[PDB]
Design an enzyme around this catalytic site. Structure first.
Site, PDB file in Angstrom:
ATOM      1  N   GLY A  21       4.934  49.155   6.703  1.00 27.04           N
ATOM      2  CA  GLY A  21       5.908  49.454   7.739  1.00 27.04           C
ATOM      3  C   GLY A  21       5.326  50.144   8.961  1.00 27.04           C
ATOM      4  N   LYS A  46      -0.155  56.763   4.481  1.00 25.35           N
ATOM      5  CA  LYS A  46       0.381  57.016   5.810  1.00 25.35           C
ATOM      6  C   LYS A  46      -0.731  57.468   6.757  1.00 25.35           C
ATOM      7  CE  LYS A  46       4.653  58.565   6.490  1.00 25.35           C
ATOM      8  NZ  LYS A  46       5.786  59.537   6.489  1.00 25.35           N
ATOM      9  N   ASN A 100      13.245  50.013  -0.825  1.00 23.57           N
ATOM     10  CA  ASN A 100      14.236  51.081  -0.854  1.00 23.57           C
ATOM     11  C   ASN A 100      15.486  50.666  -1.611  1.00 23.57           C
ATOM     12  OD1 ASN A 100      16.330  49.955   0.924  1.00 23.57           O
ATOM     13  ND2 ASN A 100      14.941  50.413   2.629  1.00 23.57           N
ATOM     14  N   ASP A 143      18.348  63.628   5.977  1.00 29.99           N
ATOM     15  CA  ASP A 143      18.701  62.202   6.124  1.00 29.99           C
ATOM     16  C   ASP A 143      18.707  61.487   4.773  1.00 29.99           C
ATOM     17  OD1 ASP A 143      19.461  59.796   7.417  1.00 29.99           O
ATOM     18  OD2 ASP A 143      17.395  59.223   7.819  1.00 29.99           O
ATOM     19  N   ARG A 147      18.322  54.137   2.121  1.00 32.94           N
ATOM     20  CA  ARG A 147      17.104  53.701   2.809  1.00 32.94           C
ATOM     21  C   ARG A 147      15.937  54.653   2.571  1.00 32.94           C
ATOM     22  NH1 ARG A 147      20.733  54.981   6.786  1.00 32.94           N
ATOM     23  NH2 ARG A 147      20.470  57.067   7.701  1.00 32.94           N
ATOM     24  N   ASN A 148      16.228  55.915   2.238  1.00 29.42           N
ATOM     25  CA  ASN A 148      15.147  56.865   1.984  1.00 29.42           C
ATOM     26  C   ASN A 148      15.038  57.188   0.507  1.00 29.42           C
ATOM     27  OD1 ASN A 148      14.289  57.177   4.704  1.00 29.42           O
ATOM     28  ND2 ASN A 148      16.006  58.576   5.087  1.00 29.42           N
ATOM     29  N   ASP A 161      10.617  60.807   2.468  1.00 29.85           N
ATOM     30  CA  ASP A 161      10.809  61.346   3.813  1.00 29.85           C
ATOM     31  C   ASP A 161      11.502  62.687   3.749  1.00 29.85           C
ATOM     32  OD1 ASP A 161       9.701  59.039   4.877  1.00 29.85           O
ATOM     33  OD2 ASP A 161      11.441  58.488   6.087  1.00 29.85           O
TER      34      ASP A 161
END
Length: 282
Positions: A21, A46, A100, A143, A147-148, A161
């Site tokens: 990503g 990352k 995810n 958040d 999705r996380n 995250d």
């Protein structure tokens, strides 16, 4: 950057692979375990982009430092190592091969395998458990959303995250076209007050995501109309394929008064009990 022998991996032990990503790439780590030097482990790496700034770099360092302090748990994305010397910064974390939770759920909707009702409550339980761990380390996610939540090859839910630092643009959409404001507690949205209680609100929306098999909250609702719905005390409808008990759990997470919402400890306990009583026969 300073070396930290707790976490340092020699760059030649990391075989970089396909992008995941945009920055994150898939990789293979040789002998991640000092005890186990001849084994390859798939990991996610990352790193900064070629246009990165000092600020971009400082954020990555801070995410890595926060992860070291927070420590390990089965239901979060764990730090596994880092390449910090003589070359670009690499922060190496656990790889989640099934994507995810939103993707994972959508791909398993009725016409991969099917998810039982027990399976769905188990997803909720695992996420609650991850969040309870994080709360216990004084980490506020800010958040929490499907999705996380990342899903491993063995179907373990891992919160991702959590270690990021925040500045916020309400009109900015995700890559999938949705508005992050739809997961925000009202006190977080209106008074910029973020707490464990406001994460619990987000978890309520996440529960709704799970039981709609990756449904999208407030479809077609722009930011300005979302504000009006929140001020009027509007609450999303009950999904089908959702017990009254789980829906009341959602509504409790969505208490207008932050102190009256359940805690993550309470949610883990309730979900524990419900999992055991939920059929896997459909």
């Amino acid at each position: 950057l300073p070396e930290d022998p707790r976490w340092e991996l020699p760059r030649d032990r990391l075989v970089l692979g396909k992008p995941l990503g945009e920055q994150v790439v898939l990789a293979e780590a040789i002998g991640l375990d000092k005890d186990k030097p001849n084994r390859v482990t798939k990991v996610a790496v990352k790193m900064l982009k070629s246009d990165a700034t000092e600020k971009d770099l400082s954020d990555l360092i801070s995410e890595m430092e926060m992860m070291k302090m927070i420590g390990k748990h089965k239901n979060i994305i764990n730090l596994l190592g880092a390449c910090t010397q003589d070359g670009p910064l690499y922060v190496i974390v656990e790889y989640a091969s099934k994507g995810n939770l939103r993707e994972y759920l959508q791909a398993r909707r009725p016409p991969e395998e099917q998810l039982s009702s027990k399976d769905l409550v188990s997803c909720a339980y695992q996420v609650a458990r991850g969040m309870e761990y994080l709360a216990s380390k004084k980490c506020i996610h800010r958040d929490l959303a499907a999705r996380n939540v990342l899903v491993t090859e063995d179907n373990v839910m891992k919160i991702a995250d959590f270690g990021l630092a925040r500045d916020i643009d309400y009109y900015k959409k995700t890559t999938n076209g949705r508005l992050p404001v739809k997961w925000m507690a009202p006190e977080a949205l209106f008074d910029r007050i973020y707490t464990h209680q406001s994460d619990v609100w987000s978890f309520g929306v996440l529960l709704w995501e799970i039981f709609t098999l990756g449904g999208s909250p407030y479809p077609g609702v722009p930011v300005e109309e979302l504000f009006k719905l929140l001020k009027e005390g509007h609450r999303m409808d009950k999904p089908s394929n959702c017990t009254n008990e789980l829906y009341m759990m959602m509504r409790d997470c969505w208490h207008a008064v932050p102190s009256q919402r359940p805690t993550f400890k309470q949610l883990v306990e309730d979900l524990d009990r419900i999992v055991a009583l939920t059929s896997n026969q459909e």
